[PDB]
Amino acid sequence: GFPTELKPGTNQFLTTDDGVSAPILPNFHPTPCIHIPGEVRNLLELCQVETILEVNNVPTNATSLMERLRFPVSAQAGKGELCAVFRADPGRNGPWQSTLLGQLCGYYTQWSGSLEVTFMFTGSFMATGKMLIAYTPPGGPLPKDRATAMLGTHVIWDFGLQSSVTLVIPWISNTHYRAHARDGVFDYYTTGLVSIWYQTNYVVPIGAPNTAYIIALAAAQKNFTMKLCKDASDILQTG
Amino acid sequence: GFPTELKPGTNQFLTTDDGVSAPILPNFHPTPCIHIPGEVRNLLELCQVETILEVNNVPTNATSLMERLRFPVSAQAGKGELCAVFRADPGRNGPWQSTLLGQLCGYYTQWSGSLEVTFMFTGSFMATGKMLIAYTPPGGPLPKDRATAMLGTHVIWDFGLQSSVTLVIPWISNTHYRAHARDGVFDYYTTGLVSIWYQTNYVVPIGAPNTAYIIALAAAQKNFTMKLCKDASDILQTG
Amino acid sequence: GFPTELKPGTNQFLTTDDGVSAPILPNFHPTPCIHIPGEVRNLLELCQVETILEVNNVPT
Amino acid sequence: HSTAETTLDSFFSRAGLVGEIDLPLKGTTNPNGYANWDIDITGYAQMRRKVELFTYMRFDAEFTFVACTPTGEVVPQLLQYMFVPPGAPKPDSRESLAWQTATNPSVFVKLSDPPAQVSVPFMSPASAYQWFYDGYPTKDLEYGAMPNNMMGTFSVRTVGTSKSKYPLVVRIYMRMKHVRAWIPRPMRNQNYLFKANPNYAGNSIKPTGASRTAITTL
Amino acid sequence: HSTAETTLDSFFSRAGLVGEIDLPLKGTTNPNGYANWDIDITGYAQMRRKVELFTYMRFDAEFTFVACTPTGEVVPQLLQYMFVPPGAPKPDSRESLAWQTATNPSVFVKLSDPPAQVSVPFMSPASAYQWFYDGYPTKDLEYGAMPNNMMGTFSVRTVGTSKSKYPLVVRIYMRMKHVRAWIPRPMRNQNYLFKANPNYAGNSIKPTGASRTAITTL
Amino acid sequence: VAQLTIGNSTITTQEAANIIVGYGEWPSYCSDSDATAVDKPTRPDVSVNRFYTLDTKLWEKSSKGWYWKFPDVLTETGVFGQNAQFHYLYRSGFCIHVQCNASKFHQGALLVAVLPEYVIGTVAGGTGTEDTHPPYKQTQPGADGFELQHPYVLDAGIPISQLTVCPHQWINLRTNNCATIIVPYINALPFDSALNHCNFGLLVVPISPLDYDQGATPVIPITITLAPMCSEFAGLR
């Protein structure tokens, strides 16, 4: 016959090798692929969808869980008071775990791209005021007050004019390698910071609730990317 | 199927065979090669770089080691005196071991090409005189004096006119095979010889140091070549 | 993968089989063949050369 | 700049272990030197929650078979892996004529011979295997039962009339190839209780993720 | 007239032994019939000083696995070599579910089957594995620690539930392919003291090379 | 001779000796299609890119050598030490200029070179059995620099007899006083922390010892003037 020399690797079964194998049913014509609505092709499609960010990820009591979904603002907050705060950490625990984006991030090891958090004022329509939502880039420390936050990337939101406002988080990268406990994890360190202050107090006329809630939705821009699949989960199929 | 006949060699694992093997991560897109300054492609690039030749490779006392780097010339040397001497032996021990060239030569078995040793007078600027740097080709015996050296390839260097002078060593070849002890080593025998004589004495006016030092740098021309990798080293990774 | 059937003869080492084998030193560039006088190519060249015939092959 | 790692096919390839068969000599476990494994892709723990991201999918699956003794040792035993397509009848005994039905593909391989490997197609009669079904197949115990998702059965056994001389362990890996998916849906945040339904533990209802003290302390 | 032998790729190819795993039966050494080897290319003695000629490099590496018993004997044992990319979790026990994670490539090969062989790519997130780092990762014990140089971990183990019946030895060779390098620097002339730093022995400071009596006697 | 000015900084130097452009590349900028096209990296022109003239170190017979870390030498100093700290990323180049002011009666030779990722390895306890990590005053010595203790191994277990393999230039007193070098940004990354990572280090060692007869000034003022080239920053704090 024809001359050969088997090279090392012969007979190995690589869980990742993606060659072809013999068909079990050679004659079988599998029922045709028809048209189904909403076909997903690449997962990054889903990363660009907005999902509620549980910023108020504090109540854990079983029937208050519907509250992590929206934080509130009220008349009782003096001008300059810190309303809320969280980091630009899609992967790591906390608020981002509720967002779909965060959830996908868990099947990947590295990633980077611009994020986008949109806020929604769902209070009475008769309410007005202003909020100062500031972003303190990675490394920068949470501004001491509303004034110092007013000197860095910020946005005065008059929920009196527009019911919605969207903020773009320029960049976040989870690529710096950490070999802490004994388990080497690829962590941020790029914990950007989003602070929210009462620029003015909550002004509402008589007859309107003195407390409104705000919902914060999040998604990743189109410049987003992920690398290295890493199947991981606390919820697996039970016996 | 298709007819074959496995030939001898089948299943062997050659540390040198450079075939291809199955990728462990088929989907993985490794982070892009960006532009980094000073990229080295072939090692011979480094062999053409000048590195200090420890001609004065005699002091070994820990804090005098900075002296092997430069030998001296002084008023006290009479006309014709031998200032220094060494061989054209990049591989073999001694002065050349300090040069980068010499160091690379150790990962190779055979080699040949023209060398180039440049001298630097780093004395007072008020000094003058002349040196006679002669090359006695392989086989030729060290000239008895300054006169007999003056009859063979030589150069009168007036460190009074030019602060630097470069000498070319025409050729050296480490290819003659020697099976001495029981360990077969590929050695020169082409030990060319570079002698350096005081053509005149060191003339310096009042107020100037009566001793200057000279630094000798070395590199190999472009006609240089190396053959047969031979990993060897006294310094290996420790436990 | 691709379908095969090993035929008899597989694994045999024929002292005469002249196939190719893997190079031990893949990077090595052996020193160049220069010109040497009198190169012999076929032995019959030598058979046409005269050599003394010991006809008197008797004294020992 | 590239985004190929996040494609469905990428996300899902890789052979994952979805099944393990024990064929001990002395045992309560598969006493007849044979076994039946209706093909379940939930065998790979991780898998259940991953696929349940979508409602409809479609794919082919390359199976590879790794067999040895418990110490992970190799032996001179022959084996018959048989595939009983959905609809065909599974062998009830170590001598059920189902072992001989030609329409039940079978691949014979010696334990020594590297892993046997075969591709199985998109069986389902429906245009897609669908993970959720809001109805009943024509309070009932048949809710959410999408039937037409059967991939088949894999019958494994030592070859021969007599019991095999050794204790054996077959492992079934599965690479999913040519994956297409539709209708995406909320990632399971609650622990799984049963293979069939989304039934969760109404007592142990946990927040999707970690919590903190105040919405002002990071 | 040719100069191909002195090219970087030439200088660096060749599979060199960078690792050896002992999986004895009776032992203090790897008592659980399994082992974890974070990929270190300094395993080949010679290698450390060679690569440290440059500051930045880049490459792929083909690994070949040679396994047998201490007498250099072959046996009917199956093996699972697993690669846990950086970031993934290493197996802590001979039954850690890490052995089953699909995203941890695994190649199964019988000891008899010739050496298994696979190519691993340029992992690093940085544009190049860099040998020296003049800083700290965001007097400190973290100086010169360039993190993003992790190639992964190689988990080796006998296959199966039970301990393997034989004493085993795996050897890991590594050919470096497609090598590119930048910024050249002074050849290490002082003995190496630790894997992490250039720390040398301030007492035993030796002249780069041999010495002589006078600068006039050859 | 002729004097050059970059802002309020006016140094007096020689016409134009031979400059050394490290690795033949010129400290250029980083184009728009990079990793951060959102947070436009502002390129300091005004005063940020001007002449910084450091505390002149004095040469002696006994001097071992000196080294500074970059960008550490300036993250302390001026309006560039303002941006280096209160900014998240950095990429820069450097026109380094080293001068000696000595008479035609002193003699010596200085090798001046730049070494990327100059990682200082200490002595390690002496016998070799102490894994001591160099202090923070040795790892990042500010604009006062630092004196090598083991010039022969460059305090890093490497022969200096080979340092010429890096961008270098010589300062032989009998031939020249000024020595200049142009360094392009070098790192495995387009940007990087200007505080946690010293891309490189300036090394200036006396290879031929300073000498002079009695009476001549015993020290040679080595003045190091340097300036940033096409430097870039990104992400204020």
Side-chain angles (χ1 to χ4, degrees):
Chain A
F2 168 60
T4 314
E5 289 204 4
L6 283 218
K7 293 304 180 192
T10 307
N11 300 283
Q12 62 169 39
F13 162 66
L14 225 188
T15 75
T16 72
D17 193 48
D18 73 307
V20 78
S21 27
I24 199 63
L25 273 354
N27 299 299
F28 188 61
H29 276 62
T31 99
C33 30
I34 81 177
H35 185 70
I36 308 300
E39 175 166 0
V40 173
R41 291 216 156 72
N42 189 302
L43 288 181
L44 272 154
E45 304 178 22
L46 302 154
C47 304
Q48 300 169 183
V49 185
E50 290 222 68
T51 32
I52 307 181
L53 208 199
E54 293 187 10
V55 180
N56 173 28
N57 65 320
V58 289
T60 76
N61 144 57
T63 56
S64 286
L65 288 176
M66 265 288 100
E67 293 169 359
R68 335 185 84 231
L69 307 174
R70 72 288 180 291
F71 56 77
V73 324
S74 78
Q76 300 82 294
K79 58 186 187 72
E81 264 191 57
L82 177 69
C83 170
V85 67
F86 63 70
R87 30 193 38 144
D89 62 334
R92 296 166 26 185
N93 299 180
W96 290 85
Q97 288 176 287
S98 72
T99 58
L100 170 61
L101 180 73
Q103 282 312 333
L104 296 175
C105 287
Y107 289 77
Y108 285 85
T109 311
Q110 288 171 47
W111 66 69
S112 66
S114 291
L115 295 190
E116 159 243 284
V117 179
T118 316
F119 299 103
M120 180 168 290
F121 186 72
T122 69
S124 170
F125 148 97
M126 287 296 316
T128 190
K130 282 191 152 65
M131 293 300 283
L132 192 163
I133 306 122
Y135 175 56
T136 323
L142 177 151
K144 27 184 296 183
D145 42 38
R146 166 226 138 246
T148 61
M150 185 279 289
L151 298 159
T153 297
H154 72 293
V155 181
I156 271 71
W157 181 34
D158 183 300
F159 45 105
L161 307 189
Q162 45 192 293
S163 293
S164 263
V165 69
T166 307
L167 167 45
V168 163
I169 296 304
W171 197 277
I172 62 93
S173 191
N174 168 293
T175 46
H176 210 295
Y177 190 23
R178 176 199 277 95
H180 59 286
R182 195 161 197 58
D183 184 58
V185 310
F186 261 100
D187 200 53
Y188 283 101
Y189 85 94
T190 70
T191 51
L193 266 191
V194 179
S195 39
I196 289 161
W197 320 74
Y198 284 90
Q199 172 57 55
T200 65
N201 66 304
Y202 180 71
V203 175
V204 96
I206 321 175
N210 323 284
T211 299
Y213 286 78
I214 297 185
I215 307 176
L217 311 169
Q221 232 82 89
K222 303 192 173 180
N223 69 322
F224 205 72
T225 30
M226 300 205 130
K227 255 170 59 173
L228 229 225
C229 301
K230 182 187 84 289
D231 290 359
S233 191
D234 326 305
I235 331 171
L236 310 75
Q237 175 65 299
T238 52
Chain B
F2 168 60
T4 314
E5 289 204 4
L6 283 218
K7 293 304 180 192
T10 307
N11 300 283
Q12 62 169 39
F13 162 66
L14 225 188
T15 75
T16 72
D17 193 48
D18 73 307
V20 78
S21 27
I24 199 63
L25 273 354
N27 299 299
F28 188 61
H29 276 62
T31 99
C33 30
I34 81 177
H35 185 70
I36 308 300
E39 175 166 0
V40 173
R41 291 216 156 72
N42 189 302
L43 288 181
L44 272 154
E45 304 178 22
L46 302 154
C47 304
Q48 300 169 183
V49 185
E50 290 222 68
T51 32
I52 307 181
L53 208 199
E54 293 187 10
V55 180
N56 173 28
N57 65 320
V58 289
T60 76
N61 144 57
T63 56
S64 286
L65 288 176
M66 265 288 100
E67 293 169 359
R68 335 185 84 231
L69 307 174
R70 72 288 180 291
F71 56 77
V73 324
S74 78
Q76 300 82 294
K79 58 186 187 72
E81 264 191 57
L82 177 69
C83 170
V85 67
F86 63 70
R87 30 193 38 144
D89 62 334
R92 296 166 26 185
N93 299 180
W96 290 85
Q97 288 176 287
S98 72
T99 58
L100 170 61
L101 180 73
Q103 282 312 333
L104 296 175
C105 287
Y107 289 77
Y108 285 85
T109 311
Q110 288 171 47
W111 66 69
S112 66
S114 291
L115 295 190
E116 159 243 284
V117 179
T118 316
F119 299 103
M120 180 168 290
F121 186 72
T122 69
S124 170
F125 148 97
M126 287 296 316
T128 190
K130 282 191 152 65
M131 293 300 283
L132 192 163
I133 306 122
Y135 175 56
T136 323
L142 177 151
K144 27 184 296 183
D145 42 38
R146 166 226 138 246
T148 61
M150 185 279 289
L151 298 159
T153 297
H154 72 293
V155 181
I156 271 71
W157 181 34
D158 183 300
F159 45 105
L161 307 189
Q162 45 192 293
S163 293
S164 263
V165 69
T166 307
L167 167 45
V168 163
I169 296 304
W171 197 277
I172 62 93
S173 191
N174 168 293
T175 46
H176 210 295
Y177 190 23
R178 176 199 277 95
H180 59 286
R182 195 161 197 58
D183 184 58
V185 310
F186 261 100
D187 200 53
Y188 283 101
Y189 85 94
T190 70
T191 51
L193 266 191
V194 179
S195 39
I196 289 161
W197 320 74
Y198 284 90
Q199 172 57 55
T200 65
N201 66 304
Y202 180 71
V203 175
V204 96
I206 321 175
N210 323 284
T211 299
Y213 286 78
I214 297 185
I215 307 176
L217 311 169
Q221 232 82 89
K222 303 192 173 180
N223 69 322
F224 205 72
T225 30
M226 300 205 130
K227 255 170 59 173
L228 229 225
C229 301
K230 182 187 84 289
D231 290 359
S233 191
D234 326 305
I235 331 171
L236 310 75
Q237 175 65 299
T238 52
Chain C
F2 168 60
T4 314
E5 289 204 4
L6 283 218
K7 293 304 180 192
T10 307
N11 300 283
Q12 62 169 39
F13 162 66
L14 225 188
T15 75
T16 72
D17 193 48
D18 73 307
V20 78
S21 27
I24 199 63
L25 273 354
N27 299 299
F28 188 61
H29 276 62
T31 99
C33 30
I34 81 177
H35 185 70
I36 308 300
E39 175 166 0
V40 173
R41 291 216 156 72
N42 189 301
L43 288 181
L44 272 154
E45 304 178 22
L46 302 154
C47 304
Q48 300 169 183
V49 185
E50 290 222 68
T51 32
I52 307 181
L53 208 199
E54 293 187 10
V55 180
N56 173 28
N57 65 320
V58 289
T60 76
Chain D
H1 68 60
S2 184
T3 69
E5 271 215 272
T6 41
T7 93
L8 256 49
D9 268 290
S10 171
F11 183 72
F12 287 112
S13 64
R14 294 185 281 299
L17 181 49
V18 286
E20 180 185 298
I21 318 305
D22 260 70
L23 301 176
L25 311 143
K26 306 302 181 312
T28 143
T29 150
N30 288 308
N32 303 76
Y34 85 106
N36 287 165
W37 179 67
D38 303 42
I39 306 173
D40 167 24
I41 53 183
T42 219
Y44 178 10
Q46 317 273 20
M47 193 69 77
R48 174 152 180 183
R49 188 198 194 216
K50 291 179 66 179
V51 293
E52 272 183 56
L53 172 71
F54 309 104
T55 311
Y56 311 117
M57 285 186 78
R58 199 161 191 282
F59 55 75
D60 306 310
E62 168 185 286
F63 293 104
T64 335
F65 298 56
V66 187
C68 56
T69 72
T71 38
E73 192 185 359
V74 204
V75 273
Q77 190 64 48
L78 188 60
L79 308 183
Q80 182 194 318
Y81 300 140
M82 164 176 272
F83 173 68
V84 323
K90 316 175 192 62
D92 59 61
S93 67
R94 196 174 195 287
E95 53 284 301
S96 182
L97 279 68
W99 290 121
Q100 266 113 309
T101 301
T103 52
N104 281 327
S106 282
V107 348
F108 299 70
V109 48
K110 309 176 190 61
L111 216 98
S112 29
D113 289 328
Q117 196 193 71
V118 311
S119 288
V120 184
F122 175 68
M123 301 314 278
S124 188
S127 189
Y129 294 110
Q130 79 178 70
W131 303 157
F132 306 75
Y133 189 70
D134 190 356
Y136 307 94
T138 307
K139 200 298 177 186
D140 205 28
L141 310 171
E142 308 268 359
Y143 182 59
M146 159 50 141
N148 338 73
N149 277 185
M150 183 66 272
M151 277 140 267
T153 307
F154 264 98
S155 288
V156 214
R157 58 161 295 172
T158 114
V159 159
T161 62
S162 312
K163 225 73 165 192
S164 161
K165 314 173 57 177
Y166 323 65
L168 297 179
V169 188
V170 173
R171 293 211 181 58
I172 300 160
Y173 290 76
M174 184 194 82
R175 203 192 79 205
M176 272 195 239
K177 53 186 185 179
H178 307 155
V179 172
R180 238 148 86 78
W182 298 268
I183 318 303
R185 57 204 301 142
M187 292 277 286
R188 180 76 175 199
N189 75 311
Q190 292 310 306
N191 273 105
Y192 280 119
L193 299 186
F194 312 97
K195 301 226 170 189
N197 51 47
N199 274 46
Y200 50 79
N203 275 27
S204 320
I205 292 189
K206 312 297 187 178
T208 314
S211 310
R212 57 161 152 180
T213 310
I215 189 157
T216 60
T217 58
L218 17 70
Chain E
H1 68 60
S2 184
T3 69
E5 271 214 272
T6 41
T7 93
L8 256 49
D9 268 290
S10 171
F11 183 72
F12 287 112
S13 64
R14 294 185 281 299
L17 181 49
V18 286
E20 180 185 298
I21 318 305
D22 260 71
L23 301 176
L25 311 143
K26 306 302 181 312
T28 143
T29 150
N30 288 308
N32 303 76
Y34 85 106
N36 287 165
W37 179 67
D38 304 42
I39 306 173
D40 167 24
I41 53 183
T42 219
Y44 178 10
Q46 317 273 20
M47 193 69 77
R48 174 152 180 183
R49 188 198 194 216
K50 291 179 66 179
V51 293
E52 272 183 56
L53 172 71
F54 309 104
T55 311
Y56 311 117
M57 285 186 78
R58 199 161 191 282
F59 55 75
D60 306 310
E62 168 185 286
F63 293 104
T64 334
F65 298 56
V66 187
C68 56
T69 72
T71 38
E73 192 185 359
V74 204
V75 273
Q77 190 64 48
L78 188 60
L79 308 183
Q80 182 194 317
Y81 300 140
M82 164 176 272
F83 173 68
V84 323
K90 316 175 192 62
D92 59 61
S93 67
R94 196 174 195 287
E95 53 284 301
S96 182
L97 279 68
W99 290 121
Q100 266 113 309
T101 301
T103 52
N104 281 327
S106 282
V107 348
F108 299 70
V109 48
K110 309 176 190 61
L111 216 98
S112 29
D113 289 328
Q117 196 193 71
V118 311
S119 288
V120 184
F122 175 68
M123 301 314 278
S124 188
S127 189
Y129 294 110
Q130 79 178 70
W131 303 157
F132 306 75
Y133 189 70
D134 190 356
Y136 307 94
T138 307
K139 200 298 177 186
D140 205 28
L141 310 171
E142 308 268 359
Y143 182 59
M146 159 50 141
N148 338 73
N149 277 185
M150 183 66 272
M151 277 140 267
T153 307
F154 264 98
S155 288
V156 214
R157 58 161 295 172
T158 114
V159 159
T161 62
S162 312
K163 225 73 165 192
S164 161
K165 314 173 57 177
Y166 323 65
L168 297 179
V169 188
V170 173
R171 293 211 181 58
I172 300 160
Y173 290 76
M174 184 194 82
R175 203 192 79 205
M176 272 195 239
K177 53 186 185 179
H178 307 155
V179 172
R180 238 148 86 78
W182 298 268
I183 318 303
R185 57 204 301 142
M187 292 277 286
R188 180 76 175 199
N189 75 311
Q190 291 310 306
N191 273 105
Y192 280 119
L193 299 186
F194 312 97
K195 301 226 170 189
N197 51 47
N199 274 46
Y200 50 79
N203 275 27
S204 320
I205 292 189
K206 312 297 187 178
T208 314
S211 310
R212 57 161 152 180
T213 310
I215 189 157
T216 60
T217 58
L218 17 70
Chain F
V1 56
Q3 52 176 56
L4 28 149
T5 312
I6 312 175
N8 62 305
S9 58
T10 321
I11 58 164
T12 65
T13 180
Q14 298 172 294
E15 289 163 61
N18 301 84
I19 45 151
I20 299 303
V21 186
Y23 302 116
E25 289 177 50
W26 278 84
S28 55
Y29 285 114
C30 234
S31 39
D32 287 295
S33 49
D34 219 46
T36 289
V38 211
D39 190 293
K40 338 275 293 187
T42 49
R43 308 168 186 175
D45 268 294
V46 275
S47 68
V48 192
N49 292 335
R50 58 151 241 159
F51 288 151
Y52 296 101
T53 319
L54 342 197
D55 277 300
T56 290
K57 295 304 142 193
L58 291 155
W59 191 345
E60 296 178 46
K61 298 203 166 180
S62 58
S63 300
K64 312 239 80 301
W66 296 272
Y67 73 75
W68 291 259
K69 288 298 177 55
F70 283 64
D72 169 74
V73 51
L74 276 180
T75 43
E76 198 63 71
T77 315
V79 74
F80 176 78
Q82 184 58 50
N83 291 306
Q85 299 187 301
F86 303 86
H87 257 66
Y88 187 40
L89 296 172
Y90 141 107
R91 84 183 305 300
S92 184
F94 282 95
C95 164
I96 308 178
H97 187 60
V98 185
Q99 315 143 63
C100 275
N101 303 87
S103 78
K104 308 189 200 166
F105 289 98
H106 299 74
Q107 32 161 282
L110 283 196
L111 168 55
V112 189
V114 213
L115 166 53
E117 309 300 358
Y118 184 359
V119 176
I120 295 295
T122 46
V123 174
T127 45
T129 53
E130 255 67 271
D131 206 37
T132 53
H133 298 298
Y136 176 70
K137 301 77 195 64
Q138 209 172 297
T139 288
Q140 273 137 57
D144 282 312
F146 194 99
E147 288 192 67
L148 290 175
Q149 311 181 60
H150 297 163
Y152 191 61
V153 296
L154 302 184
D155 282 354
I158 49 186
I160 176 183
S161 63
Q162 282 164 43
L163 182 66
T164 53
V165 62
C166 291
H168 70 289
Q169 183 137 70
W170 287 92
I171 295 178
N172 186 312
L173 284 187
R174 63 165 284 140
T175 50
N176 69 300
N177 67 294
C178 83
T180 309
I181 289 177
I182 303 311
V183 179
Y185 180 66
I186 290 179
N187 208 63
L189 304 171
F191 272 71
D192 197 359
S193 179
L195 304 109
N196 289 169
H197 186 183
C198 293
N199 305 86
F200 71 85
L202 172 69
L203 231 63
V204 33
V205 175
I207 302 303
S208 177
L210 171 62
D211 203 1
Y212 46 87
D213 273 5
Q214 265 287 289
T217 297
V219 300
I220 301 315
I222 318 183
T223 329
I224 288 60
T225 329
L226 51 80
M229 296 180 64
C230 291
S231 60
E232 289 192 59
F233 295 108
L236 190 50
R237 295 163 314 180

